[PDB]
Design a binder for this molecule. Sequence first.
Ligand code: MG
Ligand code: MG
Ligand code: MG
Ligand code: MG
Ligand code: MG
Ligand code: MG
Ligand code: MG
Ligand code: MG
Ligand code: MG
Ligand code: MG
Ligand code: MG
Ligand code: MG
Ligand code: MG
Ligand code: MG
Ligand code: MG
Ligand code: MG
Ligand code: MG
Ligand code: MG
Ligand code: MG
Ligand code: MG
Ligand code: MG
Ligand code: MG
Ligand code: MG
Ligand code: MG
Ligand code: MG
Ligand code: MG
Ligand code: MG
Ligand code: MG
Ligand code: MG
Ligand code: MG
Ligand code: MG
Ligand code: MG
Ligand code: MG
Ligand code: MG
Ligand code: MG
Ligand code: MG
Ligand code: MG
Ligand code: MG
Ligand code: MG
Ligand code: MG
Ligand code: MG
Ligand code: MG
Ligand code: MG
Ligand code: MG
Ligand code: MG
Ligand code: MG
Lengths: 199, 130, 134, 156, 80, 87
Amino acid sequence: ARYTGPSWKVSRRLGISLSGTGKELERRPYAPGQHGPTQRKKISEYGLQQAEKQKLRHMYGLTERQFKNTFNKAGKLQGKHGENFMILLEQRLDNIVYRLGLARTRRAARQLVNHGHITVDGKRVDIPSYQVSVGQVISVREKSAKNSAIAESLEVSSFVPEYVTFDAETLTGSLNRLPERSELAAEINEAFIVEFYSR
Amino acid sequence: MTDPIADFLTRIRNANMVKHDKLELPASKIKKEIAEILKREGFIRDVEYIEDDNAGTIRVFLKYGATGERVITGLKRISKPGLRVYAKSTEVPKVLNGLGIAIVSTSQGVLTDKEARAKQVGGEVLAYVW
Amino acid sequence: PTINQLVRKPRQSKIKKSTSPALNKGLNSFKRELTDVNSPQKRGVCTRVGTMTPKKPNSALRKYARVRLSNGIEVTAYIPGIGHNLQEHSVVLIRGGRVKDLPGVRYHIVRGALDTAGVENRGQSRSKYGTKKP
Amino acid sequence: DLEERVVTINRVAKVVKGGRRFRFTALVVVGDKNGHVGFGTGKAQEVPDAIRKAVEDAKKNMVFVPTVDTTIPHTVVGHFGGGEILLKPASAGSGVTAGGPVRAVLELAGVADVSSKSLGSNTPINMVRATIDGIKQLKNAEDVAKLRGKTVEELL
Amino acid sequence: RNQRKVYTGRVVSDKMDKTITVVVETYKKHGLYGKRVKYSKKFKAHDENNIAKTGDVVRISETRPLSATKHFRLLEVVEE
Amino acid sequence: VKIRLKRMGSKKKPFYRIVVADSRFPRDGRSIETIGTYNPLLDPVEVKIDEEATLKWMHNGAKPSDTVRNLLSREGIMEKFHNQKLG
RNA sequence: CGGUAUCUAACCAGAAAGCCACGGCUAACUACGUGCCAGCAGCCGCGGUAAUACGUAGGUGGCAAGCGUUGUCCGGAUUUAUUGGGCGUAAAGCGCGCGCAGGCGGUCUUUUAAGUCUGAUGUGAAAGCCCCCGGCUUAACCGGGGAGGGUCAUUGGAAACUG
RNA sequence: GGUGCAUUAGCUAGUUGGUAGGGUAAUGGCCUACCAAGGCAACGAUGCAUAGCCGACCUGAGAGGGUGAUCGGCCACACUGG
Ligand SMILES: [Mg+2]
Ligand SMILES: [Mg+2]
Ligand SMILES: [Mg+2]
Ligand SMILES: [Mg+2]
Ligand SMILES: [Mg+2]
Ligand SMILES: [Mg+2]
Ligand SMILES: [Mg+2]
Ligand SMILES: [Mg+2]
Ligand SMILES: [Mg+2]
Ligand SMILES: [Mg+2]
Ligand SMILES: [Mg+2]
Ligand SMILES: [Mg+2]
Ligand SMILES: [Mg+2]
Ligand SMILES: [Mg+2]
Ligand SMILES: [Mg+2]
Ligand SMILES: [Mg+2]
Ligand SMILES: [Mg+2]
Ligand SMILES: [Mg+2]
Ligand SMILES: [Mg+2]
Ligand SMILES: [Mg+2]
Ligand SMILES: [Mg+2]
Ligand SMILES: [Mg+2]
Ligand SMILES: [Mg+2]
Ligand SMILES: [Mg+2]
Ligand SMILES: [Mg+2]
Ligand SMILES: [Mg+2]
Ligand SMILES: [Mg+2]
Ligand SMILES: [Mg+2]
Ligand SMILES: [Mg+2]
Ligand SMILES: [Mg+2]
Ligand SMILES: [Mg+2]
Ligand SMILES: [Mg+2]
Ligand SMILES: [Mg+2]
Ligand SMILES: [Mg+2]
Ligand SMILES: [Mg+2]
Ligand SMILES: [Mg+2]
Ligand SMILES: [Mg+2]
Ligand SMILES: [Mg+2]
Ligand SMILES: [Mg+2]
Ligand SMILES: [Mg+2]
Ligand SMILES: [Mg+2]
Ligand SMILES: [Mg+2]
Ligand SMILES: [Mg+2]
Ligand SMILES: [Mg+2]
Ligand SMILES: [Mg+2]
Ligand SMILES: [Mg+2]
């Protein structure tokens, strides 16, 4: 991926349990390093905006320049800026693979997309940043097929969001309709990232 | 001297600040047109034309809302003798984001912003009032 | 002013001079003239070295140098880092940037781009001072 | 309820024959996201006491902000003292763009889409006073329609 | 057919032979302020035989180059 | 005056414009009036052409090239030009 | 070009991470060494024995096959202010008058269309910004259509305002 | 229609116009003889300095500011001068 370091470190510093359910924050919820269990300090507006940017960036696991380019392209759309930015972030192939049950984290989905183990409309895709559209399907092209990892991922995969429909008999998933901000993270404040990029 | 319409606007502004109720000044065609427009949009209460054998005068009663609220909160002059301003049909401005009005003299006489943009005609903008 | 006063004579800006004039021109030997060409770095030949004292309240000695540039300009540059391998009649690469401590010094010396050497025993900020990874 | 935020604290002095005496003056902006906001100043030998006094002062001079469609109805300019603040409406989802004190007062007021510019001095108290003064001459379509004796559809 | 440019101006100098000088004035917006400014340009016109007198408004029309700097001919004299 | 074929697009990916221009001008330089497109990469060739200005230029003395002649023949401009000459 | 793009099989976590910064502006601190020396530095300025600012170690923050420094331009700068500043005391009213050119000009009527406003015709190449569609596994990139841009020439209209 | 200087105020004499002629694909002091003393200029003539021009590129909320890399159109040059 972009970054192969420890995953509990970034979540502990950020304050939220991204890519999991509190299991990274079960113990010592303070920031990493030797400082953070000792004391804290004040937070300014710049700190809050940077924190929200990090929330998004390390939640979706994509680099900074591509993040800003996606924000700029989302600005081209019509509607509220942050909502469009988030919903275009939700169009990522990695996000669809992860939330569809074929994996468990963002890293697993990214690697499983890099090797081409999935396919859209019978076309092998090695691009994690591929933007899925309405009616596009996914599959496994019988590469992993009877693989232990995908079976385990489908076992422990919570549930499926209502904006995507997936059946496990043929491992087929497709976007029902466009997701809304209502069915999204909501641990973040999307109103601050636009201001942060506005300075 | 130079500009009588600016004197008109300044007279209403001063009387409004002093909370005066009545104002009188010498009359003309354009002055009567401006007074009639202001009466139509209800900025003023009433206007009379008193006949005197020099030019005639116009008398306007300033209107105030309940609890002594000023109906007219500002008048600005746009076209000046030293710099005239002309606006096209698609360039007419909205005063105070539609809360106020503007006066424009077009080929069909003196109108407001709504009338000018309804007929797709342009002229010269005289003043903003809000 | 009035609009007529503005049409009679228009507004004018203020010409802002630069900070590093010696980097803003080159020399033509055929015409023996000076031309306006701006450059990020230049190279020159040392003439003398020494250490002068700053103004109040500072008192520590600072390492400087005097250089003739490619255009024959008497330029006083500063030597960063700890220790140096500089002396008279040496080729040096001068770079922009002035120091407030010395009233006359206006330029820095790049370490590791020419006859000038790097800094020994440097672990942090290694890109500057011209030290390679150990 | 009422949420408060601290803007600035300044240590002021006064000369006596025995030396000097210092004390802290704190500026605090209070408000709730319903559309009510205010500002206050406090002075004390200790910073928390100054903050508490500033909060108590700010609780006594509250104002109201028209926030139709989560946006200022029209552009306005404040003129208090040597400070100047220009507020103008912004599109939905544009966030808030303002200076420090102006950002604080606008965020506590409740608005979400507005863009402002500072055209004068940067002293925080004068900036806050200019922002409040500019908020004073805001308008609502219903109020001006009632003033002019007509309906909103006729006016808009 | 086509048409030629016509200019209405005032005679300034008529002391040449069979030709005069005419000033044409027009207004224009400024580059940055948009104010009217007078703009007078002098052309040379050709008459039949020394008819026009100084300070008489005349209309002149475009034509071929008759001389070194002479590109207009007198169309008529409106008044004095 | 020839109804020529101008090349643009990208490396190893050419696309062509059927355009009329003078033989003394650069291939990608000045031209008179573009009339069509020609895409070679697709196995079935997609050629769009006005078929009305082309006949006017042919009448006025605009000799095409070999491939432009082939395209006009396949699209029927050459046969219609012969018919117009006969009629 | 060229056995080139592409595709098919077997093996391999193995052959692939660095730079700057951490007192405030500005995101991120502990210890040791030094002692107005060595030195840092865009500014406020730090260094005289308890240094979060000098060098190193540990830690943390930003970016990423890139990261820092310098040079030039625009912004912030309303710091030439038409949009958008001023002249009692901070820089800024000539010592005063007579007056050519120039700038501006009380009220009403008729008339002209120079200014003003508007319709139609021609033109403002291609490529570029922008909008909608597509093609390359995505993107960069490429293709199609559309839109924008003039105190532009011909000509038909209205006469409130300036002339 | 698109630049800096007034601490650069007068410049010009085939110049300004006419009568005939020669020359060119074509009009034209483009050239010749003759006749008169004209012409341009504070709406900046003349002079000094810098500079190929545009579609366009960078920035900017916009008005504006800076530049003429790649590509397209026009112009000038080919060691210097004829
Ligand atoms: Mg938009
Ligand atoms: Mg350092
Ligand atoms: Mg008080
Ligand atoms: Mg003719
Ligand atoms: Mg061929
Ligand atoms: Mg080979
Ligand atoms: Mg191959
Ligand atoms: Mg093998
Ligand atoms: Mg092996
Ligand atoms: Mg291997
Ligand atoms: Mg393996
Ligand atoms: Mg490995
Ligand atoms: Mg590597
Ligand atoms: Mg240190
Ligand atoms: Mg380290
Ligand atoms: Mg790190
Ligand atoms: Mg910006
Ligand atoms: Mg500016
Ligand atoms: Mg002004
Ligand atoms: Mg000022
Ligand atoms: Mg004054
Ligand atoms: Mg003074
Ligand atoms: Mg005086
Ligand atoms: Mg004085
Ligand atoms: Mg005087
Ligand atoms: Mg005068
Ligand atoms: Mg008049
Ligand atoms: Mg075009
Ligand atoms: Mg091109
Ligand atoms: Mg596509
Ligand atoms: Mg493109
Ligand atoms: Mg295109
Ligand atoms: Mg196109
Ligand atoms: Mg457009
Ligand atoms: Mg009339
Ligand atoms: Mg231009
Ligand atoms: Mg230019
Ligand atoms: Mg002849
Ligand atoms: Mg040159
Ligand atoms: Mg570019
Ligand atoms: Mg700006
Ligand atoms: Mg360029
Ligand atoms: Mg080149
Ligand atoms: Mg070119
Ligand atoms: Mg050559
Ligand atoms: Mg040579």
